[PDB]
Amino acid sequence: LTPPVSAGGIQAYLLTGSGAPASGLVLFVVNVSNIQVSSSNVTNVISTVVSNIQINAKTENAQTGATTGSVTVRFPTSGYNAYYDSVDKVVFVVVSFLYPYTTTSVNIPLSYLSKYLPGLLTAQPYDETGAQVTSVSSTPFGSLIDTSTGQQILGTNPVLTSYNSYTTQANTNMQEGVVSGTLTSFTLGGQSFSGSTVPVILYAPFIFSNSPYQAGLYNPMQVNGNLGSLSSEAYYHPVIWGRALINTTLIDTYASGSVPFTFQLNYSVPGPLTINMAQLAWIASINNLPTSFTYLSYKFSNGYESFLGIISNSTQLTAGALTINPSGNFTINGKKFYVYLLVVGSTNSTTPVEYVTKLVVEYPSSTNFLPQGVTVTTSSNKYTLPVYEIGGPAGTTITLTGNWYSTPYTVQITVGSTPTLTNYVSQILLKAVAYEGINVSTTQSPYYSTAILSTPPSEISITGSSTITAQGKLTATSASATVNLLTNATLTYENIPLTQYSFNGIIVTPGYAAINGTTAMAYVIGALYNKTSDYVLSFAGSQEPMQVMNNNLTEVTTLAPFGLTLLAPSVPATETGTSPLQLEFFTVPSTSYIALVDFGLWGNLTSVTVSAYDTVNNKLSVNLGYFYGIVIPPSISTAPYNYQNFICPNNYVTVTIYDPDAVLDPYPSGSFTTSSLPLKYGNMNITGAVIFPGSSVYNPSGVFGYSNFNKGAAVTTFTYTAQSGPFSPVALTGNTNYLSQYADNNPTDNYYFIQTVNGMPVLMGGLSIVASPVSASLPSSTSSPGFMYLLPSAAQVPSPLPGMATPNYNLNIYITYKIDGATVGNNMINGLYVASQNTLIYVVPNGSFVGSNIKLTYTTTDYAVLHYFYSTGQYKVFKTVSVPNVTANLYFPSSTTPLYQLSVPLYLSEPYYGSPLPTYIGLGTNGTSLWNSPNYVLFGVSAVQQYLGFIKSISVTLSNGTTVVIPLTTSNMQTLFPQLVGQELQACNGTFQFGISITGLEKLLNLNVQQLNNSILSVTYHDYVTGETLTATTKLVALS
């Protein structure tokens, strides 16, 4: 039992799961293990306990939590059912609250109940009245006594009426039922009883939860105070960036165990957008093409080429020695027409260049002028039509001859020198819809908690409405016309005779950078001029969206046709007309985020509505969830550093990068993957994205929701692993072809996620480092994605939601010289290194330390930031860390020093020599200074003997003004310095102490003991680290 029931306490549990007898059953238990019970007194103990139970029954509005009716009830003195189990030592009662068993009792098999009361398989329960029995019967709710009244609960009472009617009540009125119990405190057999149950929910509708989060979704990072102004409104206006997960909670009382949920997301922007569109192909009857023109086919991002489509009555097109066979045929009321599809390019070719897979031509019906359509097929009735190439060197001309009806026509193409691109630019009221699925489980029914993507890598349908308009001149024998569509696309008709058709039309594709040629839409418009009572020129047009895959341009669906009619009773006339027109583009999966940024549907003004479906039970949400879109630029900063940040092994410099758009998963160290499939939603099967938590990428099969669904072997598993070399880097391992299906929180690999087309990422984002004067860089040309395991910091305990991510990334930088030239196996320590999770180490030679520097550049990971801030440059940020110069010093303790004393200390000081104790500087030869530091270690590498300076000269200037310069030799030093080593005095304070010895100095000069030696002593030292030459002096004194 979860939760447990205390000594003499009361608790309640809902009967659920497989084999559960009916809905709306709750089990109450009181713990009676605290005393002995026997066949002699069992009737008295159950009677005593069940007398003291009180039950409270409520109805509520499921969104707001407002109470809408409440009753409180007590068991009668006879006619109830209550039991005792000897094995588990508990008294129990089952109450039935909901239809149909509100007034009548229901029977619960003892096999089932053993889940909660396992003792029941060991011995049969005691009944009331002391018997034992094999089966349990509910006490019905409609039998209990109203404590308000002292009588049986009324049949007319609103709570009982509601519970008896719950199916339509929950759906229509958003009603929820809630029940709880308590035991009025009493003493029995020398023990005492007291308590109150947890409440339980009997029924509730399928909704997004709206308390405390009023919108049904939330972003943890905004609820905690981390986004500035935006934290004022986190409970009713959630914001999220393009590729990340947003958290949500659903209430579901139909569910048991795990459930697949499918979701539908609708995107919208205030007011119309300006869209840029390129012409993929041009289709016309041979009468409508101009007599002479210049053309060369454009080549799109996916390799597809623009084509020119001629329709004619002739069984071939003829061009001298070359003849072209038709790609396909169609018939209209017994007349037969042929379609020729051509690419103008390099050389006349007899094999297919590429294909078009279904193609609808629309025409006005002869009877009624309503639209009708036919699909063009090959001469053996297969649907895929081939496209041919004609061409030659630039300025070569090709004449094609064909027929329209009875009349021969010639067209004269000149092979252009540069690709013909036609751009149309229009204003359209765009919107888009997308679909997504996840598998969710819970330990706290009926609450299902989960997170869903901001933008899924599914097919996404971008959709919008526009206008077509026609103008026309009609006459006794022929008619002439023009049409406009997509703001500035124009089509024209050569004069159409009475009873004859003519065709024209265009196929268009998005004119943006990465995605062009991957999706298209086709309009083919036929015209007919005929005499009735009135003269009628009629137009009919197809509308079909298409996609390119493996060089077939293929039909996705057909939308409805459209039609326009111009009517004249007068013989000569001019007329005009209009119709609505529709536009639809289906994205190919990898392109889906780029499309939404490019068209303008994703940005600071966008708003999204979400609905949800349970795939086990076939239910839809009775409310909708809401969220809003945001784009935020990066920023870089550093904590203030002096020279002290570079002395001893525990000192370092901290750089903080702020970039919320790099946090795709609200949990730090979290991971997920994604794949595309058909999903069940409503009563239909629709292409969508399925999210899998973890670090393995899958190629699934079947339809998500049904029992076909099978995710196969893991195609690739990504992991961060330790590696060889010094220190030990942690870096990403796994097949890089699949990074466009993996999400983490690391900016050194997050830039691939839904931003990779043709196998190359659109934005080379992340962190880049350069170092000087020892030239090094990361990433190097050979370096993989994920060269270090950089992750964001977690929100701490005073925050409302701890352990969740923060937009700050903290990077630690160390610069040092003490371990330069160390070796770790085969490795030589010099240059720039990654260490641990968030650490960089730079090791440089002694002579290059002051002035050494690192320059860090951070570029955004998200394509929306690159797009909206390209011009201003706010998508990159830079910082540089460098080692400052410091003032060293050498000094005898006092200006005057007495000759009486045998040794007079000379102290050297320079901050950058400091280390943990002990450390010492040795002297010898021509005054060479050697530094040793045995206790120094940095990430496992330990310090090496360094050569850091020299004593340059030592001199005495005597009382007659003569100056003596003492030559440094292996013999002279040992007298002047009796110990050849100077020790450091305290930890990390570089101040070394040496014993220049007067007793030695006398003998080394042979100068008269004191009588000559009212003199100035001098010493000088050069250090390589700073470059300074220090000097110190003292007047040697005695009575003179």
Ligand X SMILES: *[C@@H]1O[C@H](CO)[C@@H](O[C@@H]2O[C@H](CO[C@H]3O[C@H](CO)[C@@H](O)[C@H](O)[C@@H]3O)[C@@H](O[C@H]3O[C@H](CO)[C@@H](O)[C@H](O)[C@@H]3O)[C@H](O[C@@H]3O[C@H](CS(=O)(=O)O)[C@@H](O[C@@H]4O[C@H](CO)[C@@H](O)[C@H](O)[C@H]4O)[C@H](O)[C@H]3O)[C@H]2NC(C)=O)[C@H](O)[C@H]1NC(C)=O
Ligand Y SMILES: *[C@@H]1O[C@H](CO)[C@@H](O[C@@H]2O[C@H](CO[C@H]3O[C@H](CO)[C@@H](O)[C@H](O)[C@@H]3O)[C@@H](O)[C@H](O)[C@H]2NC(C)=O)[C@H](O)[C@H]1NC(C)=O
Ligand Z SMILES: *[C@@H]1O[C@H](CO)[C@@H](O[C@@H]2O[C@H](CO[C@H]3O[C@H](CO)[C@@H](O)[C@H](O)[C@@H]3O)[C@@H](O)[C@H](O[C@@H]3O[C@H](CS(=O)(=O)O)[C@@H](O)[C@H](O)[C@H]3O)[C@H]2NC(C)=O)[C@H](O)[C@H]1NC(C)=O
Ligand U SMILES: *[C@@H]1O[C@H](CO)[C@@H](O[C@@H]2O[C@H](CO)[C@@H](O)[C@H](O)[C@H]2NC(C)=O)[C@H](O)[C@H]1NC(C)=O
Ligand V SMILES: *[C@@H]1O[C@H](CO)[C@@H](O[C@@H]2O[C@H](CO[C@H]3O[C@H](CO)[C@@H](O)[C@H](O)[C@@H]3O)[C@@H](O[C@H]3O[C@H](CO)[C@@H](O)[C@H](O)[C@@H]3O)[C@H](O)[C@H]2NC(C)=O)[C@H](O)[C@H]1NC(C)=O
Ligand W SMILES: *[C@@H]1O[C@H](CO)[C@@H](O[C@@H]2O[C@H](CO[C@H]3O[C@H](CO)[C@@H](O)[C@H](O)[C@@H]3O)[C@@H](O[C@H]3O[C@H](CO)[C@@H](O)[C@H](O)[C@@H]3O)[C@H](O[C@@H]3O[C@H](CS(=O)(=O)O)[C@@H](O)[C@H](O)[C@H]3O)[C@H]2NC(C)=O)[C@H](O)[C@H]1NC(C)=O
Binding site for ligand X (CB under 6 A): 220, 227-230, 245, 247, 319-322, 347-348, 392-393, 396, 398-399, 449, 451, 604, 630-633, 665-667, 670-672, 693-694, 801, 803, 868
d(CA 222, CA 236): 11
By CB under 6 A, the residues from 381 to 400 that bind ligand W are: 381
Q: CA angle 802-806-809, nearest 5°?
A: 135
Q: Which does 219 bind (CB under 5 to 8 A by kind): ligand Y, ligand V, ligand Z, none?
A: none
Q: Which listed residue (443, 1006, 1009, 1039) binds ligand V by CB under 6 A?
A: 1006
d(CA 976, CA 1014): 19
| Residue 909 engages ligand Y in binding (rule: CB under 6 A) | no
d(CA 410, CA 389): 19
Q: Going by C-beta distance under 8 Å and a sequence separation of 6 or more, which residues neighbour residue 398?
A: 319, 390, 391, 392, 412, 413, 415
| Residue 377 engages ligand W in binding (rule: CB under 6 A) | yes
Q: Going by C-beta distance under 8 Å and a sequence separation of 6 or more, which residues neighbour residue 287?
A: 404, 407, 409, 494, 502
User: What phi and psi, each to the nearest 5 degrees, are found at residue 475?
Assistant: -145, 175
Return the closest-CA partner of residue 343 out of 386, 393, 403. 386
**Candidate segments 35-43, 250-258, 321-329, 509-517, binder of ligand U by CB under 6 A:** 35-43
Interaction pattern, residues 152-191, with ligand U; x per rule: CB under 6 A: ------------------------------------xx--
Q: Which does 514 bind (CB under 5 to 8 A by kind): ligand W, ligand U, ligand V, none?
A: ligand W
Q: Which does 384 bind (CB under 5 to 8 A by kind): ligand Z, ligand X, ligand Y, none?
A: ligand Y
CB 1039 within 8 A of CB 898: no
Beta bridge partners of residue 668, listed in sequence order: none
Interaction pattern, residues 923-962, with ligand V; x per rule: CB under 6 A: -----------------------------------x-x-x
Q: Closer to ligand U at the Cβ: 130 or 225?
A: 130
d(CA 877, CA 857): 6
Q: Closer to ligand Y at the Cβ: 378 or 669?
A: 378
| Residue 883 engages ligand U in binding (rule: CB under 6 A) | no
Q: Which residue has the tokens 């390129």?
A: 278
CB 107 within 8 A of CB 9: no
Nearest distance, CB of residue 805 and ligand X, angstroms = 10
Which is it for strands 552-555 and 349-356: parallel, antiparallel or unpaired? parallel
**Candidate segments 325-333, 585-593, 683-691, 715-723, binder of ligand W by CB under 6 A:** 325-333
d(CA 810, CA 582): 50
Q: Which listed residue (2, 18, 38, 650) binds ligand U by CB under 6 A?
A: 38
d(CA 553, CA 518): 9
| Residue 651 engages ligand Y in binding (rule: CB under 6 A) | no
Quote the distance between the C-alpha of residue 145 and its chain's center.
57
Nearest distance, CB of residue 958 and ligand V, angstroms = 6
Q: Which listed residue (440, 794, 1012, 1016) binds ligand V by CB under 6 A?
A: 1012
Q: Which does 414 bind (CB under 5 to 8 A by kind): ligand V, ligand Z, ligand Y, none?
A: none
Beta bridge partners of residue 965, listed in sequence order: 955
Q: Closer to ligand Z at the Cβ: 472 or 949?
A: 949
Q: Which listed residue (499, 989, 999, 1029) binds ligand W by CB under 6 A?
A: 989
| Residue 552 engages ligand Y in binding (rule: CB under 6 A) | yes
| Residue 1009 engages ligand V in binding (rule: CB under 6 A) | no
Q: Closer to ligand Y at the Cβ: 251 or 385?
A: 385
Residue nearest to ligand Z (CB): 847
d(CA 288, CA 402): 12
Which helix or strand (DSSP H or E) is residue 386 part of? strand 385-391
Q: Which listed residue (34, 41, 471, 484) binds ligand U by CB under 6 A?
A: 41
d(CA 573, CA 586): 42
Q: Which listed residue (77, 229, 331, 775) binds ligand W by CB under 6 A?
A: 331
Q: Closer to ligand Y at the Cβ: 143 or 547?
A: 547
| Residue 38 engages ligand V in binding (rule: CB under 6 A) | no
CB 216 within 8 A of CB 625: yes
Nearest distance, CB of residue 27 and ligand U, angstroms = 23
Quote the distance between the C-alpha of residue 836 and its chain's center.
25
| Residue 516 engages ligand W in binding (rule: CB under 6 A) | yes
Interaction pattern, residues 837-856, with ligand Z; x per rule: CB under 6 A: --------xxx---------
Q: Letter for the amino acid at 965?
A: V
Q: Count of residues binding ligand U (CB under 6 A)? A: 9
Nearest distance, CB of residue 977 and ligand V, angstroms = 20
Which helix or strand (DSSP H or E) is residue 1004 part of? helix 998-1005
Q: Letter for the amino acid at 167?
A: T
d(CA 497, CA 479): 7
d(CA 803, CA 795): 5
Q: Closer to ligand Y at the Cβ: 357 or 853?
A: 357
| Residue 736 engages ligand W in binding (rule: CB under 6 A) | no
Six-digit token pair at 322?
Answer: 């070359």
Q: Closer to ligand Z at the Cβ: 80 or 405?
A: 405
| Residue 45 engages ligand U in binding (rule: CB under 6 A) | yes
Nearest distance, CB of residue 117 and ligand U, angstroms = 21
CB 571 within 8 A of CB 475: yes
Q: Going by C-beta distance under 8 Å and a sequence separation of 6 or more, which residues neighbour residue 747?
A: 657, 659, 662, 765, 766, 767, 790, 809, 858, 861
By CB under 6 A, the residues from 904 to 963 that bind ligand W are: 907
| Residue 893 engages ligand W in binding (rule: CB under 6 A) | yes
Return the closest-CA partner of residue 139 out of 16, 256, 46. 46
Return the closest-CA partner of residue 492 out of 501, 483, 503, 479. 483
Q: Which does 38 bind (CB under 5 to 8 A by kind): ligand Z, ligand W, ligand U, none?
A: ligand U
Q: Closer to ligand X at the Cβ: 409 or 931?
A: 409
**DSSP 8-state class, residue 711:** -
| Residue 648 engages ligand V in binding (rule: CB under 6 A) | no
Quote the distance between the C-alpha of residue 300 and its chain's center.
29
Nearest distance, CB of residue 904 and ligand V, angstroms = 19
Quote the distance between the C-alpha of residue 858 and its chain's center.
19
Beta strands per DSSP E along 684-822: 684-693, 696-698, 714-717, 719-722, 730-733, 742-743, 756-757, 760-761, 766-772, 776-778, 808-816
Q: Which listed residue (86, 357, 579, 582) binds ligand Y by CB under 6 A?
A: 357
d(CA 916, CA 932): 11
Q: Closer to ligand V at the Cβ: 121 or 964?
A: 964
User: What phi and psi, each to the nearest 5 degrees, are found at residue 31?
Assistant: -80, 125
Nearest distance, CB of residue 666 and ligand Z, angstroms = 49
By CB under 6 A, the residues from 76 to 105 that bind ligand U are: none
Per CB under 6 A, residues contacting ligand W are 278, 301, 329-331, 374, 377, 379-381, 421, 511-514, 516, 893, 907, 985-986, 989, 991
The residues of the shown chain that bind ligand Z, judged by CB under 6 A, are 313, 334-336, 403, 405-406, 845-847, 928, 946-947, 1024
Binding site for ligand V (CB under 6 A): 958, 960, 962, 964, 1005-1007, 1012
Where do contacts with ligand U occur on this chain (CB under 6 A)? 35-38, 40-41, 45, 188-189
Binding residues for ligand Y (CB under 6 A): 355, 357, 384, 550-552, 554
